[PDB]
């Protein structure tokens, strides 16, 4: 599909394709649309009865559908 | 100042104040306005000539002012 907002595909001097995130000013080799990466310290992944992933934060002792690695909901 | 968007301060049955993030559906004891917490694996913090923190991602081999722990820019 389309790149997510703020991202651009570029080509370097040698003709290699890479990706730029203008929201953070990073560049990276992998397409951000593709898609190990560990969860941050103190977190675990579990699955609901329906097989939907969710995230357990043992630091704060809370849970969320939002993957802390990506900011994306497991429900979307 | 004000709570950040999506957050609410609540009181529990015992009268203890806690914080709710309706964007992620977590709750937590700490005020989100206050604000260990390690950087994620493969990251380091450095400082510019001006003493401004920035973040080095050795996984992707890139750098950013945006703290991966918070999504907030070191420049804001």
């Amino acid at each position: 599909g389309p790149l997510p907002p703020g991202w651009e595909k570029r080509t370097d001097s040698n003709g290699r394709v890479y990706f730029v995130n203008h929201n953070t000013r990073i560049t990276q080799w992998e397409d951000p649309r593709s898609q190990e990466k560990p969860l941050p310290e103190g977190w675990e992944m579990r699955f609901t009865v329906d097989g939907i992933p969710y995230f357990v934060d043992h630091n704060r002792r809370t849970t969320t559908y939002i993957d802390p690695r990506t900011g994306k909901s497991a429900l979307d | 100042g004000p709570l950040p968007p999506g957050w609410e301060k609540r009181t529990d049955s015992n009268g203890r104040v806690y914080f709710v993030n309706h964007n992620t559906r977590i709750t937590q004891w700490e005020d989100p306005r206050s604000q260990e917490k390690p950087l994620p694996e493969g990251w380091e913090m450095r400082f510019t000539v001006d003493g401004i923190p920035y973040f080095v991602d050795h996984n992707r081999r890139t750098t950013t002012y945006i703290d991966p722990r918070t999504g907030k820019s070191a420049l804001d």
Partner: peptide, 12 residues
């Protein structure tokens, strides 16, 4: 041999 991606400022 790993290679870093191009610098934001060199590129942009």
């Amino acid at each position: 041999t790993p290679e870093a991606p191009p610098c934001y400022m060199d590129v942009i």
